[PDB]
Design a protein around this motif. Structure first.
Motif, PDB file in Angstrom:
ATOM      1  N   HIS A   1       0.850  -6.072  -4.494  1.00  0.00           N
ATOM      2  CA  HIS A   1      -0.361  -5.344  -4.076  1.00  0.00           C
ATOM      3  C   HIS A   1      -1.369  -5.145  -5.210  1.00  0.00           C
ATOM      4  O   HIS A   1      -2.567  -4.868  -4.945  1.00  0.00           O
TER       5      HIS A   1
ATOM      6  N   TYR B   1       2.215  -5.681   9.509  1.00  0.00           N
ATOM      7  CA  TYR B   1       3.023  -6.168   8.378  1.00  0.00           C
ATOM      8  C   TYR B   1       3.699  -7.524   8.654  1.00  0.00           C
ATOM      9  O   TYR B   1       3.422  -8.505   7.958  1.00  0.00           O
TER      10      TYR B   1
ATOM     11  N   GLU C   1      -1.558  -5.930   3.842  1.00  0.00           N
ATOM     12  CA  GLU C   1      -0.129  -5.805   4.202  1.00  0.00           C
ATOM     13  C   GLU C   1       0.492  -7.111   4.636  1.00  0.00           C
ATOM     14  O   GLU C   1       1.627  -7.408   4.227  1.00  0.00           O
TER      15      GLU C   1
ATOM     16  N   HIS D   1       6.985  -6.226  -3.525  1.00  0.00           N
ATOM     17  CA  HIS D   1       5.876  -5.925  -2.619  1.00  0.00           C
ATOM     18  C   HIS D   1       4.808  -5.034  -3.286  1.00  0.00           C
ATOM     19  O   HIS D   1       3.639  -5.378  -3.265  1.00  0.00           O
ATOM     20  N   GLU D   2       5.199  -3.872  -3.830  1.00  0.00           N
ATOM     21  CA  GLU D   2       4.209  -2.954  -4.404  1.00  0.00           C
ATOM     22  C   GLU D   2       3.543  -3.568  -5.654  1.00  0.00           C
ATOM     23  O   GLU D   2       2.348  -3.334  -5.900  1.00  0.00           O
TER      24      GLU D   2
HETATM   25 ZN   LIG Z   1       2.195  -2.807   1.459  1.00  0.00          ZN
END
Ligand SMILES: [Zn+2]
Length: 866
Positions: free
Chosen positions: A297, A377, A316, A293-294
């Protein structure tokens, strides 16, 4: 505290293009010098309005001139009479050690680190703290060398030196313009795992993972996951990392899971640290998910950021969708989909029925940190996934390419993203856009009819979204509604009308619509809303036999699990009504037989078997009901487990034994087998007491991994077995020094069915491994009691509400963000009976009268009491 409105967006009067930061770092008093290059875009007489919170102003200069034309106001420094372009210099002081809220720069154990989302940078210096202002940062850090040997910020190290008095300094430069929420700073003494990744085009990236001294044994899996994430983003999305170094820092004190600061992510150590004796299969898969996830991004969030915070879902939702696709590509797609659907149905749907309900792109916000939600999210990701369903992979990837082509290096909007998808694909998404602005869960009602004279099957589909507290008006959405039709052999009937094939994703766009299919040679059993093709509640009058047929014959594994869920829903609802009339569980024989057939099916993937044999949680069960009876739900869940354990005892023990594995591997076939084995164990714990006690106790003691040891411990607690107290004490004695491992035990204590659970939970506020200073401990003990033990939280004497009020009275002052997470069970009062509502209102009124009530709690409490 004042609400802010999406419709009020306005381009900033000033931009800052470049900022040069110096930190004279010290836990008690940090001096920040910030030199910004500003350009006016607005009217020539517009003042510059900088955000700041809890800052001590030392000086203001404009082009090195001490400035007299300014005033401090609530949360701001307003500077007047400025040239069109100028150098702004601010000097201010802050105190990391006094920062118990963990927003901005604070102390985490002996380390200093930052958390700047949504608006934390304004807690560090006076700035344009809004994500449409993108600046090139250079950061110089000066600190005591013994206390802070590592001094990290975004980008690349471009200078370093030593000073007298035992200080040293490092300067960092990040060439990419960034909004300030992506700023990060870390200072401390760490062990560092170092590795490298070479991108597809040959760029070599140094990977560096910083962990507390002694934690290097728990670092390789996260490093592995980072390399996996990088490789997958290249293969799936065609995206490469764009810098020379990727740093991750694991910190123990963190209000969130992790943050995507450019080239320097900061992670709650729960989503980094894993060893086979400390972490479960689920921890390993969560580390993978969140590392990914990070990393994802970096493009969806960093290279293209958010114009304003109402666009939070733009990063998100899209990034959650990417982490789900990552997990699903690497693992079991069916298991991932199942888990994400359970989160939607059991947790997000509840939020959408609450006073905090909001569209994925909110219209009104008081405290932005309250909007990092399941809606923004998880539903945001369901919305991206619907675009993927409507366009297909190829057109979806074209839209991603157009989105980056148009928006790389700028701050964008949800509408920009939809426009790119629409332009690249030539799919009209204008009605679809309504999913961004309407809150609440749609209910889709389906009626069918088979005509033997014409061999036509007709579906009459309608939709409505009930009004929510935030929106009196609701309209029809563009609902992609995937179907499949089965003949009595279990073969798919081709969909067609008037001699032409029909797409199996139906476009449900009206309040009511009929869809007619030709050449339907046999009366079909339908699979409806396949792969949960839209985030909606389905109302269809299933027979038991249609559902068991689907469990046996449906082509997608998701549909088989989902048919089982519909089958269970019927009997959960029956048995809750019975519980309320003092009656014991009733379950037709043919329902237990469907579950026996899953256990004994040789062809079924163990990953699927395991999910079908995991009963809905008490929170998923709650969403079946208008008025929630949490005591009946808890008791019915247990009685259903006991009944299935009795009816399936021999089959459960055979499958438990057949799935034994002497080697422990973090591999998706091994995980599936072990998940099945432990799903069998849950039922076996509710068998004959001596037999259960022996089996569970033996698993705990012979486990060669935390997954198996915890499944045993959890079953001892759930079934209140004789061995329980001994096993719980053994775990405490072994693990008390390890907070992350103790979090598992606090959760078991908090969610225990024992009559004395609250008394146990209160005593544990004094436990050696517990502290109110640590958000993970708070969430594991207090949060799990209130949110994951609704039967005890909603004790009839109101003791659960009183306990939560005492905890929030502390946390409101100490750490409002964690307080606001924890208040969430209290704001669901309208879902409960009159007597519960009045005690919960009373609790909320008590909190509303708190001296120094945080904006975070204020917003939720006022909505709850409306
Ligand atoms: Zn995030």
């Amino acid at each position: 505290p004042q609400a802010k409105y999406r419709h009020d967006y306005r381009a900033p009067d000033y931009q800052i293009t470049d900022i040069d930061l110096t930190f004279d770092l010290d836990a008690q008093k940090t001096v920040v010098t910030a030199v910004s290059q500003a350009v006016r875009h607005g009217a020539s007489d517009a003042p510059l309005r900088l955000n700041g919170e809890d800052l001590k102003l030392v000086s203001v200069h404009i082009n090195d001139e001490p400035w007299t034309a300014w005033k401090e106001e609530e949360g701001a420094l307003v500077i007047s009479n400025l040239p069109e372009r100028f150098t702004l210099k601010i000097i201010n002081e802050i105190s990391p050690a006094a920062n118990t809220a963990l927003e901005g720069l604070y102390q985490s154990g002996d380390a200093l680190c930052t958390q700047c989302q949504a608006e934390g940078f304004r807690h560090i210096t006076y700035y344009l703290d809004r994500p449409d202002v993108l600046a090139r940062f250079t950061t110089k850090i000066i600190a005591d060398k013994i206390k802070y040997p590592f001094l990290l910020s975004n980008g690349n190290r471009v200078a370093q030196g030593e000073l007298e008095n035992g200080r040293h300094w490092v300067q960092w430069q990040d060439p990419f313009p960034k909004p300030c929420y992506l700023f990060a700073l870390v200072a401390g003494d760490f062990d560092v795992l170092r590795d490298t990744f070479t991108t597809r085009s040959g760029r070599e990236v140094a990977l560096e993972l910083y962990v507390d001294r002694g934690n290097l044994d728990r670092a390789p899996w996260a490093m592995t996951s980072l390399k996996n994430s990088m490789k997958w983003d290249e293969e799936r999305f065609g995206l490469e990392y764009d810098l020379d170094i990727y740093m991750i820092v694991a910190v123990d004190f963190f209000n969130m899971g992790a943050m995507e600061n450019k080239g320097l992510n900061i992670f709650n150590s729960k989503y980094v640290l894993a060893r086979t004796d400390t972490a479960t299969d689920k921890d390993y898969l969560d580390i993978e998910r969140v590392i990914g996830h990070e990393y994802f991004h970096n493009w969806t969030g960093n290279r293209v950021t958010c114009r304003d915070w109402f666009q939070l879902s733009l990063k998100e939702g899209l990034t959650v969708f990417r982490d789900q696709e990552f997990s699903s590509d690497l693992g079991s797609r069916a298991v991932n989909r199942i888990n994400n659907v359970r989160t939607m149905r059991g947790l997000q749907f509840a939020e959408d029925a609450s006073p905090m309900a909001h569209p994925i792109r909110p219209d009104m916000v008081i405290e932005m940190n309250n909007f990092y939600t399941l809606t923004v999210y998880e539903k945001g990701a369901e919305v991206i996934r619907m675009i993927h369903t409507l366009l297909g992979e190829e057109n979806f990837q074209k839209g991603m390419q157009l989105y980056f082509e148009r928006h790389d290096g700028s701050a964008a909007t949800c509408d920009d993203f939809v426009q790119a998808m629409e332009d690249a694909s030539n799919v009209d998404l204008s009605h679809f856009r309504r999913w961004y602005s309407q809150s609440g869960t749609p209910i889709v009602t389906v009626k069918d009819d088979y005509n033997p004279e014409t061999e036509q099957y007709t579906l009459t589909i309608s939709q409505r979204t009930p009004a929510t507290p935030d929106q009196a008006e609701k309209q029809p959405l563009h609902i992609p509604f995937a179907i499949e039709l089965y003949d009595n052999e279990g073969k798919v009937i081709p969909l067609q009308k008037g001699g032409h094939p029909v797409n199996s994703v139906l476009n449900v766009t009206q309040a009511e619509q009929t869809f007619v299919f030709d050449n339907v040679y046999f009366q079909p059993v339908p699979a409806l809303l396949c792969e949960f093709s839209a985030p909606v509640k389905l109302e269809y009058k299933w027979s038991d036999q249609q559902l068991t047929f689907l469990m046996r014959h449906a082509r997608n594994d998701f549909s088989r699990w989902d048919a089982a869920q519909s089958l269970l829903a019927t009997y959960i609802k029956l048995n809750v009504a019975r519980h309320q009339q003092g009656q014991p569980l009733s379950l037709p024989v043919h329902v237990a037989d469907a579950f026996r057939a899953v256990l004994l099916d040789e062809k079924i993937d163990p990953a699927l078997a395991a999910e079908i044999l995991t009963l809905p949680s008490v929170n998923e069960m709650a969403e079946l009901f208008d008025i929630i009876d949490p005591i009946a739900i808890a008791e019915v869940r247990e009685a259903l487990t006991r009944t299935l354990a009795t009816e399936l005892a021999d089959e459960l023990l055979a499958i438990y034994n057949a799935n034994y594995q002497s080697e422990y591997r973090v591999e998706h076939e091994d995980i599936a087998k072990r998940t099945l084995r432990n799903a069998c164990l849950r039922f076996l714990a509710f068998g004959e007491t001596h037999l259960a006690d022996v089996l569970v106790s033996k698993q705990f003691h012979e486990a060669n991994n935390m997954t198996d040891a915890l499944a045993a411990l959890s079953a001892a607690v759930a079934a209140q077995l004789p061995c329980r107290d001994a096993l719980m004490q053994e775990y405490d004695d072994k693990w008390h020094q390890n907070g992350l491992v103790m979090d598992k035990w606090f959760i078991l204590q908090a969610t225990s069915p024992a009559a004395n659970v609250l008394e146990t939970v209160r005593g544990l506020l004094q436990h050696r491994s517990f502290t109110m200073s640590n958000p993970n401990r708070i969430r594991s003990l207090i949060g799990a009691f209130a949110g994951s033990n609704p039967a005890a939280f909603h004790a009839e004497d109101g003791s659960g509400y009183l306990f939560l009020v005492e905890m929030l009275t502390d946390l409101n002052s100490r750490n409002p963000q964690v307080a606001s997470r924890l208040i969430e069970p209290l704001i669901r009062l309208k879902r409960y009976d009159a007597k519960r509502q009045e005690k919960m209102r009373a609790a909320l009124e008590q909190l509303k009268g708190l001296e120094n009530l945080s904006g975070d709690l204020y917003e939720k409490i006022t909505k709850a009491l409306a």
